[PDB]
Amino acid sequence: KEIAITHHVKEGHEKADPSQFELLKVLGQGSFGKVFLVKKISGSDARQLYAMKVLKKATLKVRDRVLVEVNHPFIVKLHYAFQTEGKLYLILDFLRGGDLFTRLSKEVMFTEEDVKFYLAELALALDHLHSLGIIYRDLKPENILLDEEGHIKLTDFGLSKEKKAYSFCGTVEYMAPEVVNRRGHTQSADWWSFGVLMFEMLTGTLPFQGKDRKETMTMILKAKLGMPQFLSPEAQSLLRMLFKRNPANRLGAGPDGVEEIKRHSFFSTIDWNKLYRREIHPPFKP
Ligand SMILES: C[C@@H]1O[C@@H](Oc2c(-c3ccc(O)c(O)c3)oc3cc(O)cc(O)c3c2=O)[C@H](O)[C@H](O)[C@H]1O
Ligand SMILES: [Mg+2]
DSSP, X not given: OOEEEEEEEOTTOOOOOGGGEEXXXXXXXXXXXXXXXXXXXXXXXTTOEEXXXXXXSEEEEEEEOOOOOOOOTTEEOEEEEEEETTEEEEEEOOOTTOEEHHHHHHHOOOOHHHHHHHHHHHHHHHHHHHXXXXXXXXXXXXXXXXXXXXOEEEESSEEEEOOOOOSOOOOGGGOOHHHHTTSOOOTHHHHHHHHHHHHHHHHSSOSSOOSSHHHHHHHHHHOOOOOXXXXXXXXXXXXXXXXXXXXXXXXXXSTTTHHHHHTSGGGTTOOHHHHHTTOSOOSSOO
């Protein structure tokens, strides 16, 4: 019922305040609502243009991550997040004409061909965040945006809808077993969530889902997955390899990380260089 934003800050982070920004424009951006276009006044990113959101009733959680940063084609970043007079200010990559991946998934039926495109961009994005020291934990469709051209933009910040408060409050359906049991986890937990995203894109349903959180948790830990037989052998194989309960056995967990996924037969048709250059067209345009 309330928005919680999670900001994964870098080591050299420079705290910001309202005074460090010049207001340029006020835009109405559909799903994004009222967006201020602002210009950074000082610091290393002086003169950079950003989107600013001002949230009336939101909580902010700031976390540490595990070179000057450059843009990645498939990520939007939260640059600054600060609270002033009961308000939360978010300074974000400007994403004009952007929209929600969830809006798309509700409107379309994804085929395996469609999903290969979206998951390939998402894999590049997720691996990049890992290289930056960000572990997602409960990567989910709410984290996935689309630019005006229809390409994936994964948010580098957490966003959820949140009795006692918790430092981490994730959506259980997307959580790996080792995350559910709070025994310790790594970037490999995110490849499980990646598999959950893939499963949901392909079937319109979640692979582990009970009546309550408690039941869903037990299913994630112990439930055998009923693999939909309409899926190709390649799709089936990828999902089985992502849904290994022991993270050590999970695809993407070895030293080569995301390469294990890029080399999987499910993605055999993807040219990863062309993809990164944004030279492959999306299945759906917003
Ligand atoms: C923090 C979010 O800001 C606004 O949406 C934006 C989002 C966003 C992200 C995840 C979601 O699940 C979602 O529903 C929206 O992301 C943005 C990213 C940017 O780089 C720039 C933006 O202006 C927004 C941007 O304006 C919306 O007002 C949304 O209600 C609010 O929760
Ligand atoms: Mg800040």
